[PDB]
Design a protein around this nucleic acid. Structure first.
Length: 1025
RNA sequence: UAGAAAUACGCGUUUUAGAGCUAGAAAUAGCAAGUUAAAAUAAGGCUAGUCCGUUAUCAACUUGAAAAAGUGGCACCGAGUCGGUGCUU
DNA sequence: TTGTACTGTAGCGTCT
DNA sequence: ACAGTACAA
C-alpha cells in the first residue's frame, strides 16, 4: 500500500515515479485490451511524459489584430464606395464591379479586363499621362480644372487605404525645435553640455547627405521636400520617379557603351539579382545596391551614381519600406485640398465633405475595443443606442464613460501578494516613495537613518532635487544640520537608483506647491497619475481632469493634457500603507521610515513570522470541474500545459494502485511556489506531504556517486530524475537494503516513456502564396479562385490521420478493389470531416467505407511492429522512430568521464585518477559501437549509413579519447527518440533519411497508451479490413 | 522576468491591368520598356457584429445530447524495453 | 503506372 | 514536415 511519488516539472517533460521506502520499484502485470492475443503485460511503475511545448498567445493576438485592421480597412473602402455609388452609377455603374473583379482572369471577369476605363486606348492614355497614382494626386491637388469622377475616386481610395500613421495628434522650423530640445535637455540634467549654442539642425541633417557623413559632421560641430506649394509628398515622389527614369536612361547608355556582356544579365535575367530581378523578381533595395555597387566601382563615369547609392537615393521605388514615417495629417491636408478643388464641379462632394474627412481621420480609441455588440469575449463597450456604428456617429452612440470604466477594471493587474487589490503604477507618487524608502532603509550611518532624520532629509533634499547621492547627504544635511564631520555610508554606489520623478513633475507643472506637499491631496494626485498611465489619447484624459475643476482651473491644469506615462507596478496601496500590524501599529512604509535607526527591509518584514504581516498574507492568497478549476489560474499558456499533465498524471497514478493515495509527493522560481500551494488545495477540493526539492541537491548527489547523466543518449533520464527527486525527498523527510537497491533499479531497461498524441491545431499552412502552376497540390486560397490559374498555398498542416478501410476503383479497366490505408485530415477539413465523415470520405473517392471501424489517428500515434520495433507516426506521409536504448551504468559512466577533461581536473586525486581509467578500458567505446550497430540492425534497419560510420570509425579511432567520446555522444542522433537529423562525426556529416513508407504500419499493432502509459489498448490492424 | 488585452501604420506575396517592337515558317537573336494600380492576406462561420476564426483542452472503451462520470488484482525470482511462477475470484 | 532518394522549401518590421 | 524531379520497378 505505502508509496511515494517523485515528479519533475519542465516545459516539455513531466517525469513521474512510484517508489517504496526500501527504494524497491514495484513491478506489476497490467491488462491490455483490443483484438490482440495479448491480455497481460509486465511493466515497471517508472515513466516519463514527453510532449510538444505549448504556444503562448501572442502570435494568435497579432493574427487577430491584423484580421481586424484588414477588415476595418475594407470597411473604410466600403463606406467610400457607398458614398460614391449613387453619383458614379450615372456614368459607370460597373466601376466598383470591375474593381472587385480585377483579380480574375479575362474569362472569369464578368466585364472588360481594363478596370479604370473598360477599354484599351483610354487606359493606355491614362497610364501614359499618369505613370503612377502620384501623378494623378498631384494633378488633382494643383489643377483647378474639372476631373473625371473615376480618377477622383481612385485618389480617395488610394489615399484612405494607405493613410499613414496616427503618432501625431496635432494638425501639422525643425532647427528651432532642435534648439528648444537641446535647451530642455540642458535644463533637464547637468550632463552632456552642448559644444556651442549656434547649432542649426536644418543645415546639418536635412541637407542631402548620407547618415555616416551627417553623423561625422554633426560630431565635428559638437522627409525630403521640394517646394512650399501643396502636395509635398506627391511632389517629392514625382521627383523620385523622374530621377529614377533619368538614372535608368543613363544606366542604359553607360552599360550599352561600356559593358555589352553584362547588359543581358542585369536587364533581362530576373534570377541574378539584377535590375530585372529588382523589378520583376524578389530583390530588395539593399541587396540590389550591394550587387550593383561593384559594377559601378570598378568602371568609370559613375561618381554621382556612387554618391546617390551611398545616400540610398538611387533608383528608388515609390512603395517602399521606409514610408512608415509619413503621418496622416499630410494625407488629410491633401484630401482637403482636392475636395476644395472639386467642390464646385461636384456639389455632392460639398454636401458630405466632413464625412470623407472623418473616414480618414477616425480611429477606434485605445480604450474602446472591438464593436462587438456582445458577440466577442474581448470587448468592453456599452452603447447608448442600438445603432450601426459609423465614423460619422461614433461618439453619439458609444458611452465613453462606461466603456472606459469597463476598460479600467480589466487592464490593470492585481498584486501578486495581495490578489484582491489592483496595482499602483510604476510612476505613481506613492510607488516612488516606497521604492526610495526601500533604497533609504539599507543606508547605514556611523559618525542607519532614523525616522525623524529621514523626514528631515526628505524635506530638505527630496523636496527640491531630482536625484540624490550619499555624498550629498553627508555634505548637505549631516555636515550642515547636525554639524557632523563625516558619516560612514555604503548604502548605494554613488547616486540613488530611485527618485521622486513624478513628484517633481507636479512640482514643475502646478502653481500651488503646498497642495503637492499636503498629505490630504495624495489620493487626488494618485487618481491623476493613474489616469495618465491609463490613457494616452486626448479625450478621456481631458474628461477625468475635468472633475478637479473646483481645485484649480488655470492654464497649468490645461497643460497636463499632452504629457503621458506608460507601464504598471507590481505593488498596491492596501499592502504598503494598508494592512497595519497588531502590536507595532506600523505599515510597510511606516517601518521603512523608522525602526530605531536600525531599519529593517520589506522582505524581512514579510518573512518574519513574529510580526503579523506574514500571518495576514497567506489568508489573502486563498484563491467545481477541474478544467475550470485550472482555467482561472495565472501563468503562461505554454507553462500551464505541464500543470494539466501533472494533475492528470498524479490522479491516474493514484487510480492505478487500487485508488490509494501516497504519503509524500515531491516536486522539482516563484511559479513552483504557486504550484505547491495549488496542488495542496486538492486535499480539500477534490479528495500527501508536498515537499519542495532543489535541483542542485540532486545534481550534487549525482556527482557524489557513479550514476551520472548524459542527455543525448536516451529519454529514460526524464524519469530517472523523477525517481531521484523521490529518493532525496523521502531521504530528507526521514532525517555573515535500500542503498543496495538503488544500484539495481537505476539500470532497469523498461521505463514507460509515452509521447502525447494531440490533434495539431494551428494555421492553414506555410503562408507564402506560391505562384500559378499545373500541379494539383496547390491549395485553393479562395473558393472561386482555382489554384491552376491563381496560385495558392503549399505545405498544409495536418490535424490528424484517419485510418480507413474501403473500396477504391483503379486502372483504365476500372476495378472495384479493396484498400486499407490511412488518410491525412488537415485543419480546415477537420470541421467538415467531424460534421460528416462518410460523405467527406466519399467526396475524395472512397466507396462504402466502414462506419464503425474509422480510427482517429493523431500525431505521435505509436505502432508496434515485428521484433519489438516501435515507430511513431508524424503524419499521413512520414513516420518517426520510437525505440530507445539503455546502456549499462558502467557504459554511461565511461562515456561521461571520458569527455570533459577539465571538469575531472577539479579533484585530481579521484576523478583524474578515474580519467586514467578511461584512457584504459578503451574496449568500452567499442562496446558502445556494437550496441549502436545491434540496435540499428534491430529497429533502424539502415544499411549504407552504418557502413559509412564503421569505415569512419576504423579510420579515425586513433584520436584522443575526449573528442572520441564527444563524437560518440554525437553519434546518438541515429538512435535518438524523434526524427532523423544531420549530425557530425570526426570527418563526415551523416545525412538523415525519411521513413516515407506508411505501408508497414497498416498491418502492425496500434498501441494506444494512456496519459501515464500504464494502461494500453492494442489494436492489431492486420485483422481489420 | 513575465502572463493577458486594445488601437495603428509600412512592406512582402499572388493574379490581373499598364498593347512590347523588328528580322522573322521559325525553334531564336537583337532593340524598346520596366517605378504604378485593383483585389485578397488564413477556407470561411452565424449571435450578421466595422464580430469571430492559428492561444488553451484532448490515449482506448462503456454510459451521458453534452458537461461529466465510470471501466484494468496481489507476492516472488530474474531483466533486450519486460518474462514467468504461485494465490485469488 | 507506383516506389525510393536527394533536394529545396519555410511572412515580417515597427508602433504604441 | 512537405514538394518535386528523376529514376528503379
Amino acid at each position: 500500500k505505502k508509496y511515494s511519488i517523485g515528479l519533475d516539472i519542465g516545459t516539455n517533460s513531466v517525469g513521474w515515479a512510484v517508489i517504496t521506502d526500501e527504494y524497491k520499484v514495484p513491478s506489476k502485470k497490467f491488462k491490455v485490451l483490443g483484438n490482440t492475443d495479448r491480455h497481460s503485460i509486465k511493466k515497471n511503475l517508472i515513466g516519463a511524459l514527453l510532449f510538444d511545448s505549448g504556444e503562448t498567445a501572442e502570435r494568435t493576438r497579432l493574427k487577430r489584430t491584423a484580421r481586424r485592421r484588414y477588415t476595418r480597412r475594407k470597411n473604410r473602402i466600403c463606406y467610400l464606395q457607398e458614398i460614391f455609388s449613387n453619383e458614379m452609377a450615372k456614368v459607370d455603374d460597373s466601376f466598383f464591379h470591375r474593381l472587385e473583379e480585377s483579380f480574375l482572369v479575362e474569362e472569369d471577369k464578368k466585364h472588360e479586363r481594363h478596370p479604370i476605363f473598360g477599354n484599351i486606348v483610354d487606359e493606355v492614355a491614362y497610364h501614359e499621362k499618369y505613370p503612377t497614382i502620384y501623378h494623378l494626386r498631384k494633378k488633382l491637388v494643383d489643377s483647378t480644372d474639372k476631373a473625371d469622377l473615376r480618377l477622383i475616386y481612385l485618389a480617395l481610395a488610394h489615399m484612405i487605404k494607405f493613410r499613414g500613421h496616427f503618432l501625431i495628434e496635432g494638425d501639422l522650423d525643425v532647427d528651432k525645435l532642435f534648439i528648444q530640445l537641446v535647451q530642455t535637455y540642458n535644463q533637464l540634467f547637468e550632463e552632456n553640455p552642448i559644444n556651442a549654442s549656434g547649432v542649426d539642425a536644418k543645415a546639418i541633417l536635412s541637407a542631402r547627405l548620407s547618415k555616416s557623413r551627417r553623423l561625422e559632421n554633426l560630431i565635428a560641430q559638437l522627409r525630403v521636400n521640394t517646394e512650399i506649394t501643396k502636395a509635398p509628398l506627391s511632389a517629392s515622389m514625382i521627383k523620385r520617379y523622374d530621377e529614377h527614369h533619368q538614372d535608368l536612361t543613363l544606366l542604359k547608355a553607360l552599360v550599352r557603351q561600356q559593358l555589352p556582356e553584362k547588359y543581358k544579365e542585369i536587364f533581362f535575367d530576373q534570377s541574378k539579382n539584377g535590375y530585372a530581378g529588382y523589378i520583376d523578381g524578389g530583390a530588395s533595395q539593399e541587396e540590389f545596391y550591394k550587387f550593383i555597387k561593384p559594377i559601378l566601382e570598378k568602371m568609370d563615369g559613375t561618381e554621382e551614381l556612387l554618391v546617390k547609392l551611398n545616400r540610398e537615393d538611387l533608383l528608388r521605388k515609390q512603395r517602399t519600406f521606409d514610408n512608415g514615417s509619413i503621418p496622416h495629417q499630410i494625407h488629410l491636408g491633401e484630401l482637403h485640398a482636392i475636395l476644395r478643388r472639386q467642390e464646385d464641379f461636384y456639389p455632392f462632394l460639398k454636401d458630405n465633405r466632413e464625412k470623407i474627412e472623418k473616414i480618414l481621420t477616425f480611429r477606434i480609441p485605445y480604450y474602446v475595443g472591438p464593436l462587438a455588440r456582445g458577440n466577442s469575449r474581448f470587448a468592453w463597450m456599452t452603447r447608448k443606442s442600438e445603432e450601426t456604428i459609423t465614423p460619422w456617429n461614433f461618439e453619439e452612440v458609444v458611452d465613453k464613460g462606461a466603456s472606459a470604466q469597463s476598460f479600467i477594471e480589466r487592464m490593470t493587474n492585481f498584486d501578486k501578494n495581495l490578489p484582491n487589490e489592483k496595482v499602483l503604477p510604476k510612476h505613481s507618487l506613492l510607488y516612488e516613495y516606497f521604492t526610495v524608502y526601500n533604497e533609504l532603509t539599507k543606508v547605514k550611518y556611523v559618525t542607519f537613518l532614523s525616522g525623524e532624520q529621514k523626514k528631515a532629509i526628505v524635506d530638505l533634499l527630496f523636496k527640491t532635487n531630482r536625484k540624490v547621492t550619499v555624498k550629498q547627504l553627508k555634505e548637505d544635511y549631516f555636515k550642515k544640520i547636525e554639524c557632523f564631520d563625516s558619516v560612514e555610508i555604503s548604502g548605494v554606489e554613488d547616486r540613488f537608483n530611485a527618485s521622486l520623478g513624478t513628484y517633481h513633475d507636479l512640482l514643475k507643472i502646478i502653481k500651488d506647491k503646498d497642495f503637492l506637499d499636503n498629505e490630504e491631496n495624495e489620493d487626488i494626485l494618485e487618481d491623476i497619475v493613474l489616469t495618465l498611465t491609463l490613457f494616452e489619447d486626448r479625450e478621456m484624459i481631458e474628461e477625468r481632469l475635468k472633475t478637479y475643476a473646483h481645485l484649480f482651473d488655470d492654464k497649468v491644469m490645461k497643460q497636463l493634457k499632452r504629457r503621458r506615462y506608460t507601464g504598471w507596478g507590481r505593488l498596491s496601496r492596501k499592502l504598503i500603507n494598508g494592512i497595519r500590524d497588531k502590536q507595532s501599529g506600523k505599515t510597510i512604509l511606516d517601518f521603512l521610515k523608522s525602526d530605531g535607526f536600525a531599519n529593517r527591509n520589506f522582505m524581512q518584514l514579510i518573512h518574519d513570522d513574529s510580526l503579523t504581516f506574514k500571518e495576514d498574507i497567506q489568508k489573502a492568497q486563498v484563491s467545481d470541474s477541474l478544467h475550470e478549476h485550472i482555467a482561472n489560474l495565472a501563468g503562461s499558456p505554454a507553462i500551464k500545459k505541464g500543470i494539466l499533465q501533472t494533475v492528470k498524471v498524479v490522479d491516474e497514478l493514484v487510480k492505478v494502485m487500487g485508488r490509494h493515495k501516497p504519503e509524500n509527493i515531491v516536486i522539482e522560481l516563484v511559479e513552483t511556489r504557486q504550484i505547491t500551494k495549488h496542488v495542496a488545495q486538492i486535499l480539500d477540493s477534490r479528495m500527501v506531504k508536498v515537499i519542495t526539492l532543489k535541483s542542485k541537491l540532486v545534481s550534487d548527489f549525482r556527482k557524489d556517486f557513479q550514476f551520472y547523466k548524459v542527455r543525448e543518449i536516451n529519454n529514460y533520464h526524464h524519469a530517472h530524475d523523477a525517481y531521484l527527486n523521490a529518493v532525496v525527498g523521502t531521504a530528507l523527510i526521514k532525517k555573515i537494503r535500500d542503498f543496495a537497491t538503488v544500484r539495481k533499479v537505476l539500470s532497469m531497461p523498461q521505463v514507460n516513456i509515452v509521447k502525447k498524441t494531440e490533434v495539431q491545431t494551428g494555421g492553414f499552412s506555410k503562408e507564402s502564396i506560391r505562384p500559378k502552376r499545373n500541379s494539383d497540390k496547390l491549395i485553393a486560397r479562395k473558393k472561386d479562385w482555382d489554384p491552376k490559374k491563381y496560385g495558392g498555398f503549399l505545405w498544409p498542416t495536418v490535424a490528424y490521420s484517419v485510418l480507413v478501410v474501403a473500396k477504391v476503383e483503379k486502372g483504365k479497366s476500372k476495378k472495384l478493389k479493396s484498400v486499407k490505408e490511412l488518410l491525412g485530415i488537415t485543419i480546415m477539413e477537420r470541421s467538415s470531416f467531424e460534421k460528416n465523415p462518410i460523405d467527406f470520405l466519399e467526396a475524395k473517392g472512397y466507396k462504402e467505407v466502414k462506419k464503425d471501424l474509422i480510427i482517429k489517428l493523431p500525431k505521435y500515434s505509436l505502432f508496434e511492429l515485428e521484433n519489438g520495433r516501435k515507430r511513431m507516426l508524424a503524419s499521413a506521409k512520414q513516420l518517426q522512430k520510437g525505440n530507445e536504448l539503455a546502456l549499462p551504468s558502467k557504459y554511461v559512466n565511461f562515456l561521461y568521464l571520458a569527455s570533459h577533461y577539465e571538469k575531472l581536473k577539479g579533484s585530481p586525486e579521484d576523478n583524474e585518477q578515474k580519467q586514467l581509467f578511461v584512457e584504459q578500458h578503451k574496449h568500452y567505446l567499442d562496446e558502445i559501437i556494437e550496441q549502436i550497430s545491434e540496435f540499428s540492425k534491430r529497429v533502424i534497419l539502415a544499411d549504407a549509413n552504418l557502413d559509412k560510420v564503421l569505415s569512419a570509425y576504423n579510420k579515425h579511432r586513433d584520436k584522443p579519447i575526449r573528442e572520441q567520446a564527444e563524437n560518440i555522444i554525437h553519434l546518438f542522433t541515429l538512435t535518438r527518440l524523434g526524427a532523423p537529423r544531420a549530425f557530425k562525426y570526426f570527418d563526415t556529416t551523416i545525412d538523415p533519411k525519411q521513413y516515407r513508407s506508411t505501408k508497414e504500419v497498416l498491418d502492425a499493432t496500434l498501441i494506444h497508451q494512456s496519459i501515464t502509459g500504464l494502461y494500453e489498448t492494442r489494436i492489431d490492424l492486420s485483422q481489420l479490413g
